[PDB]
């Protein structure tokens, strides 16, 4: 039976390499989402650019240019719309797992804090175990009572 106490220290020590990975792993979730955010910012930008094209298209009595220019923006706005829907979808998941990692973080700090308090009580338990050794010396004191009696003899 390997002392399971050492496992508590050894095992919790591995979490340092562990939750940081989630801290680093979740980062990708954010990099992808905001990277998508800029892409939409570019997609809306060009879609906005198409409006700028359609903005002056109708001017001077040129209807077809605006009709085509808008029909093109809708296709790009569809791309822009899709990214926003994907980005809106990501918003909840990133906020969720991040909330998880926050709680997955709260557990360890409380886990490590209680471990030290747990071991602190364990050290107190050893003293409760060690006062038994002197109580064992009280048995030697009883064995001292044994040759206290021969002393009385």
């Amino acid at each position: 039976q390997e002392a399971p106490e050492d496992l508590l220290e050894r095992l919790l020590g591995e979490m340092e390499l562990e939750l940081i990975e989630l801290r680093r792993a979740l980062a990708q979730t954010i990099a992808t989402f905001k990277s998508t955010e800029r892409q939409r910012d570019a997609q809306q930008l060009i879609a906005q650019r198409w409006y700028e094209k359609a903005q002056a298209a109708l001017d001077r009595g040129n209807e077809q240019l605006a009709r085509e220019a808008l029909g093109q923006r809708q296709s790009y706005q569809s791309h822009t719309e899709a990214l926003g829907k994907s980005l809106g979808e990501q918003r909840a998941l990133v906020e969720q797992v991040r909330g998880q990692l926050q709680k997955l973080e709260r557990k360890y700090l409380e886990l490590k804090s209680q471990k030290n308090l747990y071991l602190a009580r364990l050290k107190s338990a050893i003293a409760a175990q060690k006062i038994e050794e002197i109580a064992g010396n009280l048995d030697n004191a009883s064995a001292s009572s044994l040759f206290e009696r021969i002393e009385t003899k």
Binding site: R23, A27, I30, A31, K34
Partner: protein
């Protein structure tokens, strides 16, 4: 790794709307309240 610098922005209190709105409104509170302070003593 630049996105990891942003992870530091969120680690510290990021520019959340109400916080910065409160800080901004606090600046209005600071400037507006102080605005009358000097204007009154000189009177």
């Amino acid at each position: 790794i630049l996105e990891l610098e942003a992870e530091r922005e969120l680690l510290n209190p990021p520019p959340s709307p109400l916080d910065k709105k409160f800080e901004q409104w606090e600046e209005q509170q600071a400037v507006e309240a102080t605005l009358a302070a000097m204007k009154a003593r000189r009177s």
